[PDB]
Write a protein that binds this DNA or RNA. Structure first.
Lengths: 35, 121, 459, 65
RNA sequence: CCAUCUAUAAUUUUGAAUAAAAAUUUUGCCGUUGCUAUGGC
């Protein structure tokens, strides 16, 4: 069960990372690193 | 020109936050960007309120794209701290959605703010 | 030695003290009853020395200290006996604090030169969760949810606390032992503010169910519920009279309750930036009224989330004077965090100039009773001291105390010394988070502790 | 607990008395007997019980007052 | 709860002294900075 929680947690962060990349003209890696 | 647009003025923000609070008490409010996204997909949203001080702003910029495809009004408020307080939760909220209900007790208030947001857009 | 003769001895011995301390005598005797006439009679704003105040910060283990209540014994002129509970407590000042960690602590503040000294504490936990799940059966001895408020009885015999567990537990001051639990008997009746009527056992409790409850601590019973607020009653204040005043947060209304008459007075701000700007030819609309304090039986002040400090009069429904953006504007969000763009200019545009700037909230606001000075608080990093005009139609900034760093949840003031020469100690509970919720972003340098500032009068 | 309040107090030396309207709050109680109200009013006004008269008490719909 | 009675602590006698003895009456955790104050969770 604990493995599934990390998978769900990482999926939420992956969703936000995609948003920063798509809706940015020149995306940086600053937010992905802290994420 | 800024990514967060249109941004409601001080007078309009308070009326938006008023309706948000009443909807929260009546269980007619969906809090969070993910829950707001689901309402747009189901077409059960009156309008979307977003926080323009989100850090970074990009993590909620998919909602305007979904709104404009679905012809749902949307507006930005300056503060997420204020939006979360009005939402009734103990944490900041970046996005919220008013759920459609023609049998609600706050119908007139919702359509009043809905009209001004449409004028703003 | 009939009882009349005993009063005559004490009254005579009282007069001899006044003669020793000292036209002057006659004026002092009037000042002894000036409280009974609900008008300001303590004009000491100009005599205060804010600059020379001795500031100190005392750290506390508790996380998110939520409220502080102070007890000062007062000599009772009618019987010439100090309000101290017992002989051991003669001339001893106490402060009680509560926190979200479910802990009630008492401190000694008698020595102004020294820091507050912990004496006793009581902590709650999951052991106190009620098994019944029925509201009237919520009579467990301890707290099991966040404690939001505390108040010390004027007689020095009890201290009462309330919070999100929808109970009103009254503790014995000496041992912090619970002697009675009074449930609010409501699903959403969370106690948000407590105020004792001055020199009386009557307690006023404001609840999140939009009602105000009145209790008699000596009789350990509820008396009345007051209705009329359209949103949560966030704060409450009282003076010697039964005229308690309250603020309802988002409904943006301040109400004054005349308990005997069973009537209420409604006050509303009604300010608009459009007219404010035009008359000028950054103004923020009012969102909620969060704090209130009674300067006088006929005057009170309120603080709102747009940083407005308003002075009110019972005669006028509108404010008589307003101080906009009292505690300043919040720091502008960093451009490195607003957006993920590589180009700096693109990140700057997302700041939208000054449109995203918002003002500090007035988290605390306290006025010394029947005086011309009141103190405001926020998480700006300083306590501002204001002075009211003699005609009570305006106020100005007397000074600032920058020692406080963090959210000022509650402010209290205690005085000591001779009548002419009095030292005032300002005690403020400081926290890293707002009392009601965790909305406020973490403030750099904020700490949980009791802020103290001793102020002297000279002139 | 029971609360007793007097309002609209008129001093009437023509009949040598004080006249007033008595509002009684009795949460979780059916009502307050005239004898008990007379006792408490006598204590409040510092007068003999024999000098206190109370009448015409109607309970509010829903109870409690 | 208050008072009383104990306990703890301080000055004093025999005492080199220990000793007895009358007698009386800033933090939950982790640092830095002084000999005190503020940085992180």
């Amino acid at each position: 069960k604990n493995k599934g929680r990390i998978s769900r947690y990482l999926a939420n962060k992956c969703s936000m990372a995609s948003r920063i990349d798509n809706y940015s003209e020149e995306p940086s890696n600053v937010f992905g690193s802290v994420l | 020109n800024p990514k967060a647009f249109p941004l409601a003025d001080a007078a309009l923000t308070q009326q938006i936050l008023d309706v948000v609070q009443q909807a929260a008490n009546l269980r007619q409010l969906k809090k969070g960007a993910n829950e707001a996204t689901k309402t747009l997909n189901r077409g059960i949203s009156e309008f979307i309120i977003m926080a323009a001080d989100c850090e970074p702003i990009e993590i909620l910029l998919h909602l305007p794209l979904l709104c404009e495809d679905k012809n749902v009004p949307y507006v930005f408020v300056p503060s997420r701290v204020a939006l979360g307080r009005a939402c009734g939760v103990s944490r900041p909220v970046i996005a919220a959605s008013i759920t459609t209900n023609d049998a609600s007790a706050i119908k007139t208030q919702i359509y009043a703010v809905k009209d001004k947001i449409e004028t703003l857009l | 030695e009939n009882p009349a003769d005993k009063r005559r001895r004490l009254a005579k011995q009282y007069l001899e003290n006044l003669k020793s301390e000292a036209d002057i005598i006659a004026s002092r005797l009037k000042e002894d009853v000036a409280e009974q006439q609900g008008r300001v009679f303590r004009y000491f704003g100009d005599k205060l020395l804010i600059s020379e105040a001795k500031q100190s910060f005392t750290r506390v283990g508790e996380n998110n200290l939520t409220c502080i209540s102070c007890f000062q014994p007062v000599l009772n002129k009618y019987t010439f006996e100090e309000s101290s509970n017992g002989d051991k407590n003669k001339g001893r000042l106490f402060a009680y604090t509560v926190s979200k960690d479910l802990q009630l602590t008492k401190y000694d503040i008698t020595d102004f030169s020294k820091r507050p000294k912990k004496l006793k504490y009581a902590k709650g936990g999951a052991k106190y969760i009620p098994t019944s799940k029925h509201e009237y059966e919520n009579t467990t001895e301890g707290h099991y949810d966040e404690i939001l408020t505390v108040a010390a009885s004027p007689d020095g015999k009890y201290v009462v606390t309330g919070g999100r567990d929808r109970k009103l537990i009254v503790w014995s001051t000496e041992s912090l032992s619970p002697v009675k639990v009074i449930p609010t008997k409501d699903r959403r009746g969370e106690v948000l503010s407590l105020a004792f009527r001055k020199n009386s056992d009557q307690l006023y409790a404001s609840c999140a169910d939009f009602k105000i409850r009145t209790y008699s601590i000596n009789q350990f019973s509820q008396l009345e519920i007051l209705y009329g607020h359209h949103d949560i009653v966030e704060d409450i204040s009282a003076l010697a009279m039964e005229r308690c005043v309250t603020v309802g947060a988002r409904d943006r209304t301040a109400m004054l309750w005349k308990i005997p008459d069973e009537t209420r007075l409604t006050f509303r701000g009604g300010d608009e930036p459009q007219k404010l700007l035009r008359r000028w030819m950054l103004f923020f609309c009012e969102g909620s009224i969060d704090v209130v304090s009674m300067v006088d039986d006929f005057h009170f002040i309120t603080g709102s989330d747009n940083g407005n400090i308003c002075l009110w009069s019972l005669a006028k429904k509108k404010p008589i004077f307003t101080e906009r953006i009292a505690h300043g504007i919040l720091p502008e969000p960093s451009f490195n965090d607003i957006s993920g763009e590589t180009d700096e200019e693109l990140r700057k545009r997302q700041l939208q100039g000054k449109k995203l700037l918002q003002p500090f909230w007035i988290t605390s606001l306290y006025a010394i009773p029947y005086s011309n000075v009141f103190i405001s608080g926020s998480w700006s990093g300083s306590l501002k001291v204001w002075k009211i005009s003699d005609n009570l139609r305006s106020f100005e900034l007397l000074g600032e105390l920058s020692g406080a760093k963090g959210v000022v949840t509650k402010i209290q003031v205690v005085e000591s010394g001779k009548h002419g020469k009095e030292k005032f100690r300002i005690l403020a509970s400081i926290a890293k988070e707002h009392r009601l919720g965790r909305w406020i972003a973490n403030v750099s340098g904020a700490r949980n502790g009791i802020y103290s500032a001793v102020i002297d009068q000279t002139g | 607990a029971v609360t007793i309040r007097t309002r609209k107090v008129i001093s009437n030396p023509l009949l040598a008395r004080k006249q007033f309207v008595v509002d009684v709050l009795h949460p979780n109680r059916a009502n307050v007997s005239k004898d008990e109200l007379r006792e408490k009013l006598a204590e409040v006004y510092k007068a003999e019980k024999d000098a206190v008269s109370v009448f015409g008490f109607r309970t509010q719909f829903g109870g409690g007052k």
